[PDB]
Design a protein around this motif. Structure first.
Motif, PDB file in Angstrom:
ATOM      1  N   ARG A  12     110.567  11.409  16.590  1.00 34.42           N
ATOM      2  CA  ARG A  12     109.890  12.685  16.370  1.00 34.42           C
ATOM      3  C   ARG A  12     109.161  12.593  15.034  1.00 34.42           C
ATOM      4  O   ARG A  12     109.777  12.710  13.972  1.00 34.42           O
ATOM      5  CB  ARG A  12     110.884  13.838  16.407  1.00 34.42           C
ATOM      6  CG  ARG A  12     111.614  13.939  17.731  1.00 34.42           C
ATOM      7  CD  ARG A  12     112.363  15.247  17.876  1.00 34.42           C
ATOM      8  NE  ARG A  12     112.874  15.417  19.231  1.00 34.42           N
ATOM      9  CZ  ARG A  12     113.527  16.489  19.656  1.00 34.42           C
ATOM     10  NH1 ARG A  12     113.770  17.511  18.856  1.00 34.42           N
ATOM     11  NH2 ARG A  12     113.946  16.535  20.918  1.00 34.42           N
ATOM     12  N   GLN A  39     106.710  14.368  13.302  1.00 38.23           N
ATOM     13  CA  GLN A  39     106.527  15.459  12.349  1.00 38.23           C
ATOM     14  C   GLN A  39     107.848  15.873  11.712  1.00 38.23           C
ATOM     15  O   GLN A  39     107.908  16.131  10.503  1.00 38.23           O
ATOM     16  CB  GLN A  39     105.871  16.649  13.040  1.00 38.23           C
ATOM     17  CG  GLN A  39     104.600  16.304  13.792  1.00 38.23           C
ATOM     18  CD  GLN A  39     103.978  17.512  14.456  1.00 38.23           C
ATOM     19  OE1 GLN A  39     104.013  18.618  13.917  1.00 38.23           O
ATOM     20  NE2 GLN A  39     103.408  17.310  15.637  1.00 38.23           N
ATOM     21  N   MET A  40     108.914  15.949  12.508  1.00 40.81           N
ATOM     22  CA  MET A  40     110.216  16.303  11.956  1.00 40.81           C
ATOM     23  C   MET A  40     110.717  15.228  11.003  1.00 40.81           C
ATOM     24  O   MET A  40     111.302  15.538   9.960  1.00 40.81           O
ATOM     25  CB  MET A  40     111.218  16.539  13.083  1.00 40.81           C
ATOM     26  CG  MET A  40     110.701  17.453  14.173  1.00 40.81           C
ATOM     27  SD  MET A  40     112.017  18.358  15.000  1.00 40.81           S
ATOM     28  CE  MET A  40     112.554  19.417  13.668  1.00 40.81           C
ATOM     29  N   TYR A  92     108.883  15.714   7.761  1.00 45.70           N
ATOM     30  CA  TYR A  92     109.404  16.860   7.017  1.00 45.70           C
ATOM     31  C   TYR A  92     110.736  16.527   6.350  1.00 45.70           C
ATOM     32  O   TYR A  92     110.952  16.848   5.173  1.00 45.70           O
ATOM     33  CB  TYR A  92     109.550  18.063   7.949  1.00 45.70           C
ATOM     34  CG  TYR A  92     110.195  19.267   7.301  1.00 45.70           C
ATOM     35  CD1 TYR A  92     109.477  20.082   6.440  1.00 45.70           C
ATOM     36  CD2 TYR A  92     111.521  19.590   7.555  1.00 45.70           C
ATOM     37  CE1 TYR A  92     110.060  21.175   5.848  1.00 45.70           C
ATOM     38  CE2 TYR A  92     112.112  20.682   6.966  1.00 45.70           C
ATOM     39  CZ  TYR A  92     111.377  21.470   6.114  1.00 45.70           C
ATOM     40  OH  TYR A  92     111.959  22.563   5.523  1.00 45.70           O
ATOM     41  N   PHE A  93     111.633  15.864   7.082  1.00 45.82           N
ATOM     42  CA  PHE A  93     112.932  15.516   6.518  1.00 45.82           C
ATOM     43  C   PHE A  93     112.806  14.471   5.419  1.00 45.82           C
ATOM     44  O   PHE A  93     113.625  14.447   4.495  1.00 45.82           O
ATOM     45  CB  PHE A  93     113.868  15.023   7.619  1.00 45.82           C
ATOM     46  CG  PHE A  93     114.145  16.049   8.683  1.00 45.82           C
ATOM     47  CD1 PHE A  93     114.224  17.393   8.366  1.00 45.82           C
ATOM     48  CD2 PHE A  93     114.320  15.667  10.002  1.00 45.82           C
ATOM     49  CE1 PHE A  93     114.475  18.337   9.342  1.00 45.82           C
ATOM     50  CE2 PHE A  93     114.569  16.607  10.983  1.00 45.82           C
ATOM     51  CZ  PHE A  93     114.647  17.941  10.652  1.00 45.82           C
ATOM     52  N   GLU A 143     110.116  14.366   3.367  1.00 41.66           N
ATOM     53  CA  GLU A 143     109.613  15.161   2.255  1.00 41.66           C
ATOM     54  C   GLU A 143     110.690  16.023   1.617  1.00 41.66           C
ATOM     55  O   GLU A 143     110.553  16.386   0.445  1.00 41.66           O
ATOM     56  CB  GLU A 143     108.461  16.051   2.717  1.00 41.66           C
ATOM     57  CG  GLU A 143     107.247  15.286   3.192  1.00 41.66           C
ATOM     58  CD  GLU A 143     106.179  16.197   3.751  1.00 41.66           C
ATOM     59  OE1 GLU A 143     106.312  17.429   3.601  1.00 41.66           O
ATOM     60  OE2 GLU A 143     105.207  15.685   4.344  1.00 41.66           O
TER      61      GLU A 143
END
Lengths: 981, 76, 81, 43, 42
Positions: free
Chosen positions: C4, C6-7, C10-11, C13
């Protein structure tokens, strides 16, 4: 985060039971007075806060007693916690209506206070607890941060009393809770203890010893606000006092007391009218300038003593301001400004400078109802200069300020003293120890280029590495091209003295920008007029130590400045002296070998004699002819006249010629401290080659003089001849055709070395294998070395002795007593006898050697040479264009006599480019250059403005204005349609 | 996402912690990065949110034909 | 593990050991790519690994530009994760 | 054809859009002034 | 004495020592192959 926090911050704990304390008698060790019932001990709660793995950065917190002075807290926040000093502090008071707040108040908090605080870098002060107006402020901050999708975060301080903080026991750590874990949510809601708001950046827990109550932090908060109000903005104490303003939204009987206490400390107060409660009551009583009014907002209250409180409030009415209903949320800053000036009875320009709000200052300047006094503008300009605000200095100078009267030695000293403590300029000034700017300039520029308020400001900006201010001061200067070259030189000099690589990179970028703008300006000036451009390029600039633009470009190593066509044409014109640059080479040669022809028409110009023989090109030709004749004499002596007998006339002439060459080398090395000049001379590779040549000549002559070393001397001199001949290339680097290729030839040495390494490895392998296979019977060491290295090496050039390696081409005979079969090769140094055992392997090795060496290595080297040539073409061309000026200048000072007779010149110099202008001519030239600079800057600005990006940005701004007007129009339309029927 | 953002902007009702936890779990299961970003940025406690049971549920939401499903089956 | 993009970004970042986590993510994605039957899934995993490598390179470049000694200490330390 | 190619370029479209937004701003100013006048002076 | 191990422990000095050793090994190999490689016992 620090370990000495408990040494200066203390907490209060109960000591005498009397409950009134708030804790049960089990917890314990007429009126509960804090001073008579508490004791102070080193604090135990300090550090950072993380809200149980919250999706945001930590927040600093501290626990301290009431009696702690604000100075320690301020120093801890600004220095240890890393919070920048605030340009404004807004303390929010009030809060009612339970958890809900009226929508327009939330809009005034979000689009108003929070936006203004983010824009001006202010501190929003509230109660850090998740209750009252503090929760609304935190929600507004969160919403604004989420909506802004960028920008800097808003700094929120929460001063809350210790005791009403929910789940605070987890914050206790004697050694500091630098990592922390605080549970802000999950507990049942209670009217006593409240959690900490997660949107606040810092927390101050004032512990007065009470287990739970509200109001114990008012003293500390008010003292902190007063202390911040007395601090100075900007670098040092140069700026104005930090403005503080209390914003009142709602409240009760106690908020009136808090407002009174704040006004006693001379702090501005802002009351939001129409919000109800204390704020609305105070707004109404301020507008009126009172039993019914008190009853209207405080039912069932002490309606008798509040009249005296209102009178005490109105005694200092000048500090109270009303946020009218018609005032929008986007006018917030403006209103604050008014309040501040009403408190002063401090200028709006200095406030705008401190807040870094250029639009506010521009609007204030546009107000024609008040004329701006000269020293008001002077103070604003000084603040902008100190705080590095180029837009403000541009705006203030463009308004009509007298810069001649503004700049004073004291103000310049203040400007220089505002340098960073860790900066390079600070160290240089400390070493030089008003600042010793001239001494630093002399140290940096070597006194040959070291240095009108604009020039002083440009130097100040360059020394402090302020790019935008330096550019502005250059655009407002006078000697633009020379100042750009000098700025590039100074920045490049200071870059190598920088410890940081980032600072050096910034200085080099600024130097590149200055070089580029100087190149653009000179290009425009040359395009307009070649003669005036040349006069500008060759004149002396007193601002830069009477150094011409060519000298500054040479010291700065500005290769882009030399590479432009105007400078190259000027160099070509100077290279021909007084002769026309269009003179053909054959005409020059014919006039050189036929001097009387210099008076005919084939050359376009007793003074003619010195105008011909004084040109650099004719000096170059004469030196070339002299060196060719010297080489011819050297070869004649070496091949014919070099007998063991004592030297003849021609050999003595060669000795005299070598002596005059040595004298010329010495003169060039001197005129071009002894140790520094010696290192300069010995750093050059060509000077090393010339030193080797002269040393070998001396050694060969010395050995020749000795009777028993004559042969040796000959050998040395033979090699010496080569070292002289390969200097012809160094002579012809000045030439416009050979030189750009001679400078590329030096870039192929890495490819040559790789070829040599690969060839040496392959030669060792193949030669040793073939020598082992053949087993020659004449195994002398020189013979082995020859047949291993020299014979395979010659096979790369078509010398393949098959009869010395192939036994099928030899005569089979018994040439040795060892068992086996042997053959006799006819070669003289090929061994008298070789083995026939595995000769097919010798032939196969020869085949593989030819394939690998003659085909693979050679073509690989060709490919590498092609790649390197294509890569380094342009850089070598730029280098040659940069060094052409130095070569021409070196040939300019050469004596007009050729080396064989140059001793005559060397006797006249033993024991013993610039253009000069009138004052009016120089002034006219500078005016012409300034006009061209102004036109160039206007054209650049016009090109920037008409770009698609700027058009799109302006269209977006105009659409925003259209949206605002549409909102106003539709609101008025609804009001007129509904309320007027 | 806009509907959830507007609902979160409503201050008349406070959002209970496990309401946000359930919304975050649904967004994690259904692969909604914008929703998880919005819910985490709102102040949810990720330390209390993640549990071994919830992590097992997150891993069990893998596709049946995925490589990770085969690797987990082999590891069992 | 579930690929995944995008997730995962994000994680990353929101993580702590950013450079080492980016390098480990690149390593794990490249390892799992060659175990994928589909060429499309392998291509997606290799693209995600390239993106993680690029962001690790950018972060390390910024850190090194700020300070060379601390960047070297960050590059040579051991990541327990 | 050359004039048509020039007119349909993005730069010319953006320039014409800016001019039309300017006209819209002028009309909006007039409309809001008239709205204020009608709402205030006619009651 | 720590300077001794700081010089002879660097990777570049180890590389130089190995290069010198390999060159000497090749020189000995050539010397044996071209001169000392008689049918007699080694």
């Amino acid at each position: 985060e620090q370990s000495w926090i408990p040494k200066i911050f203390k907490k209060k704990t109960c000591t005498t039971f009397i409950c009134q304390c708030g804790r049960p008698r089990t917890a314990h060790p007429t009126v509960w007075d804090s001073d008579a019932h508490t004791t102070e001990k080193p604090t135990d709660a300090y550090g950072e806060l993380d809200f149980t793995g919250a999706g945001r950065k930590h927040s600093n917190f501290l626990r301290l007693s009431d009696r702690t002075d604000p100075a320690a807290v301020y120093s801890l926040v600004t220095r240890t916690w890393g919070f920048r000093a605030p340009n404004l502090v807004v303390s929010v008071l009030g809060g009612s209506g339970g958890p809900v707040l009226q929508t327009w108040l939330q809009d005034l908090l979000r689009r108003g206070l929070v936006r203004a605080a983010q824009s001006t870098g202010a501190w929003i002060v509230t109660g850090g607890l998740h209750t009252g107006i503090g929760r609304h402020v935190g929600v507004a901050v969160r919403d604004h941060q989420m909506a802004s999708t960028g920008g800097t975060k808003v700094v929120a301080m929460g001063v809350a009393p210790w005791g009403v903080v929910r789940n605070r026991d987890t914050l206790i750590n004697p050694k500091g809770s630098f990592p922390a874990r605080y549970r802000w949510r999950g507990d049942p809601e209670d009217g006593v203890q409240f959690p900490l708001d997660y949107n606040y950046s810092a927390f101050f827990l004032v512990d007065d010893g009470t287990h739970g109550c509200l109001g114990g932090e008012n003293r500390f908060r008010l003292r902190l606000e007063s202390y911040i109000s007395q601090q100075k903005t900007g670098v040092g104490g140069t700026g104005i006092d930090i403005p503080v303003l209390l914003l009142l939204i709602d409240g009760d009987e106690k908020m009136l007391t808090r407002i009174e206490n704040a006004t006693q400390a001379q702090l501005p107060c802002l009351l939001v009218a129409g919000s109800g409660g204390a704020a609305d009551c105070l707004a109404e009583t301020l507008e009126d300038t009172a039993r019914d009014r008190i009853r209207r907002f405080f039912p069932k209250g002490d309606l008798e003593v509040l009249q005296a409180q209102v009178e005490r409030i109105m005694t200092r009415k000048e500090l109270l301001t009303v946020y009218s209903s018609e005032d929008g949320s986007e006018e917030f800053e403006t209103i604050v400004l008014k309040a501040l000036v009403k408190a002063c009875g401090l200028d709006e320009l200095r406030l705008a400078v401190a807040w870094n709000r250029v639009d506010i200052a521009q609007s204030e300047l546009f107000r024609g109802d008040i004329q701006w006094r000269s020293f008001h503008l002077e103070a604003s300009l000084m603040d902008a200069l100190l705080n590095d605000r180029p837009e403000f200095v541009r705006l203030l100078i463009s308004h009509g300020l007298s810069l001649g009267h503004f700049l004073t030695p004291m103000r310049l000293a203040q400007l220089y003293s505002a340098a960073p403590s860790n900066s390079l300029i600070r160290n240089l000034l400390d070493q030089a120890s008003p600042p010793d700017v001239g001494h630093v300039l002399r140290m940096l520029l070597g006194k040959m280029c070291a240095p009108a308020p604009w020039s002083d400001l440009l130097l100040w900006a360059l020394l402090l590495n302020r790019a935008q201010m330096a550019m502005y001061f250059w655009e407002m200067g006078s000697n633009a091209v020379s100042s750009a070259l000098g700025a590039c030189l100074l920045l490049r000099v200071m870059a190598r003295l920088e410890p940081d690589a980032e600072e050096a990179a910034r200085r080099k970028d600024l130097a590149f920008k200055f070089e580029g703008m100087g190149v653009d300006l000179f290009g425009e000036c040359y395009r307009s007029s070649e003669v005036r451009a040349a006069r500008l390029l060759l004149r002396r600039c007193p601002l830069w130590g009477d150094a011409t633009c060519l000298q500054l470009a040479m010291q700065a190593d500005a290769r882009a400045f030399f590479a432009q066509d105007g400078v190259q044409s000027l160099l070509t014109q100077k290279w021909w002296g007084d002769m026309a640059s269009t003179t053909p080479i054959w005409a020059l040669v014919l006039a050189f070998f036929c001097p009387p022809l210099i008076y005919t028409r084939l050359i376009t110009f007793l003074r003619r004699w010195f105008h011909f023989w004084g040109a650099p090109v004719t000096i170059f030709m004469g030196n070339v002819v002299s060196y060719l004749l010297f080489l011819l004499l050297f070869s004649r002596v070496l091949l014919v006249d070099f007998q063991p007998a004592p030297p003849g006339s021609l050999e003595l002439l060669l000795y005299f010629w070598a002596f005059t060459l040595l004298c010329e080398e010495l003169r060039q090395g001197l005129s071009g401290s002894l140790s520094q000049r010696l290192r300069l001379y010995l750093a050059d590779s060509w000077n090393q080659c010339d030193l080797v040549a002269l040393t070998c000549f001396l050694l060969g002559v010395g050995c020749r003089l000795t009777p028993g070393l004559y042969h040796l001397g000959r050998t040395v001199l033979c090699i010496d001849f080569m070292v002289f001949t390969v200097r012809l290339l160094h002579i012809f680097t000045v030439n416009k055709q050979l030189g750009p290729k001679i400078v590329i030839v030096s870039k192929m040495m890495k490819d040559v070395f790789f070829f040599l390494f690969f060839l040496g490895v392959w030669l060792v392998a193949y030669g040793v294998a073939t020598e082992g296979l053949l087993r020659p019977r004449d195994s002398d060491f020189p013979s082995i070395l020859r047949r291993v290295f020299y014979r395979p090496y010659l096979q790369i050039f078509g010398q393949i002795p098959q009869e010395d390696m192939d036994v099928a081409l030899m005569e089979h005979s018994n040439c040795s007593s060892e068992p086996g079969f042997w053959a006799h090769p006819p070669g003289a140094q090929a061994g008298t006898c070789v083995s026939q055992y595995a000769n097919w392997l010798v032939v196969l090795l020869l085949v593989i050697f030819l394939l690998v060496a003659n085909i693979l290595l050679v073509n690989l080297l060709i490919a590498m040479f092609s790649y390197t040539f294509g890569k380094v073409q342009g850089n070598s061309d730029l280098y040659w264009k940069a060094q052409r000026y130095r070569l021409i200048r070196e040939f300019h000072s050469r004596p007009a006599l050729a080396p064989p007779f140059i001793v005559i010149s060397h006797l006249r110099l033993l024991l013993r480019f610039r253009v000069y202008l009138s004052k009016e001519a120089e002034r006219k030239l500078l005016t012409w250059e300034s006009v061209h600079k102004e036109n160039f800057l206007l054209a650049r600005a016009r090109d920037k403005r008409e770009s698609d990006s700027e058009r799109l940005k302006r269209t977006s701004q105009k659409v925003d204005l259209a949206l605002k007007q549409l909102g106003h129009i539709r609101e008025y339309e609804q009001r007129l349609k509904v309320l007027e029927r």
